[PDB]
Amino acid sequence: PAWXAXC
Amino acid sequence: LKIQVHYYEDGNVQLVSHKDVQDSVTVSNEVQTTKEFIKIIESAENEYQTAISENYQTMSDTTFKALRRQLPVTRTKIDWNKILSYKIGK
């Protein structure tokens, strides 16, 4: 969730 | 020009050869014709020896191989089990 997709 | 060699120490091998030469020249002086004929003999015999050593040490290996190979197309010694059983595809 910090990254774009993914986390 | 002709060459003949025979070897027989245990088995036998023989070398047999000819070369035929035709040429045209111009006549000038006694010294110059002397030199020129010799230059031709020199050139012809040295090229004939050069081919018969340098080409035959390599190219004859390749043509003799094309008559019978030293190792197969596989570069391996053949295996009797697979050779008996496997009539490999056309």
């Binding site: 990254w3 997709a5 993914x6 986390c7 | 596989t74 391996t76 295996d79 496997y86």
Partner: protein, 371 residues
């Protein structure tokens, strides 16, 4: 009775009966287990899903590939793949039909031993053979003289095969394969902030690779275009619905097959290993190989890879050669198809090791026929 043919590929298992023109069973070679405690006991869960089951239930499972670079790393996982192959995917009793196993070249003696032991003693197969995958690849095009460049999820390999006899000393293996290109795809997608870490996420990246990557013909000019216009870049949407943009990365991933330095592998690229295997072949036969470079296995499916292989190996060959890259359709499952072809034949009907032979002579029969 019809023999059973199984392609033990590192990423996907292709299998069927002998004489089928295409495999019946085609599934990812995955064994799964649950990542969390089960709480709705009335569901009646099972402890390890396999194949398309594991791929259906993806995000609640850890996903194990039991085969790494052709080496079977986990045997009880692989034994479950074969159990599912036989009783469920093909629906057959493997003790009642002969079995054909594919295997990767230059793979250790113990792998064949344990494959043999499991077939002859877990599954009690009645007769069996283990084929060098590239043989089957060449046979699948109906030709019988060439060099195969196989490139699966786990192994890339070059095998010269002339009048149907292999050249064993002239074989090459390069482990840079489809999984490794999936790995590098992760890393480069991370540049645009698209992180992927879980095995499940790995499978997403595999899917992405399989539909937006392509082999650039001309890397330098391409990458100069990619730094000049957005027109080369496009998009895909996750199982989570959100869109992801694949760009410079599209070509950069598959470029690695030609430049293994990009994954820090010093090993030569696929054009160099093909060349370097042709140049291991006897000087007479090299011409016959250049007209007969056959590609096989799923990572040979990248668009333009044939064009690139040609235009590259062109430079490695001397001028005045018919450098022709044999890249047909069905190269996808070619190895298996070749298996089915060869399995149908009375000459090959001599080759199959009888269970009784192995039973009496122990591993000493297979220790020969593996060469």
């Amino acid at each position: 009775i019809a023999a059973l043919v199984v392609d033990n590929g590192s990423g996907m298992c292709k299998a069927g009966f002998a004489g089928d023109d295409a495999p019946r069973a085609v599934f990812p070679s995955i064994v799964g287990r649950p990542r969390h405690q089960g709480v709705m006991v009335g569901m009646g869960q099972k402890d390890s899903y396999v194949g398309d089951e594991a791929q259906s239930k993806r995000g609640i499972l850890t996903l194990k590939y039991p085969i790494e670079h052709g080496i079977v790393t986990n045997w009880d996982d692989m034994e479950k793949i074969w159990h599912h192959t036989f009783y469920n995917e093909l629906r057959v009793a493997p003790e009642e039909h002969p079995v054909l196993l594919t295997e990767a070249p230059l793979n250790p003696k113990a792998n064949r031993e344990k494959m043999t032991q499991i077939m002859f003693e877990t599954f009690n197969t009645p007769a069996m053979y283990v084929a060098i995958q590239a043989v089957l690849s060449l046979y699948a095009s109906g030709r019988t003289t060439g060099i195969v460049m196989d490139s699966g999820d786990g192994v890339t390999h070059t095998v010269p095969i002339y009048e149907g006899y292999a050249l064993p000393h002239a074989i090459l293996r390069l482990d840079l394969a489809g999984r490794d290109l999936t790995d590098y795809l992760m890393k480069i997608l991370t540049e645009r902030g698209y992180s992927f870490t879980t095995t499940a996420e790995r499978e997403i990246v595999r899917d992405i690779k399989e539909k937006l990557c392509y082999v650039a013909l001309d890397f330098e000019q391409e990458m100069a275009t990619a730094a000049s216009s957005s027109s080369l870049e496009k998009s895909y949407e996750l199982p989570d619905g959100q869109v992801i943009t694949i760009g410079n990365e599209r070509f950069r991933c598959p470029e690695a097959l030609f430049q293994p330095s990009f994954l820090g592998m010093e090993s030569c690229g696929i054009h160099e290993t093909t060349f370097n295997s042709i140049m291991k072949c006897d000087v007479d036969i090299r011409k016959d190989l250049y007209a007969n470079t056959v590609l096989s296995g799923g990572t040979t499916m990248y668009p333009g890879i044939a064009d690139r292989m040609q235009k590259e190996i062109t430079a490695l060959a001397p001028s005045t050669m018919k450098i022709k890259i044999i890249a047909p359709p069905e190269r996808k499952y070619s190895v298996w198809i070749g298996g089915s072809i060869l399995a149908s034949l009375s000459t090959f009907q001599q080759m199959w090791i009888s269970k009784q032979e192995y039973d009496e002579s122990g591993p000493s029969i297979v220790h020969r026929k593996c060469f």
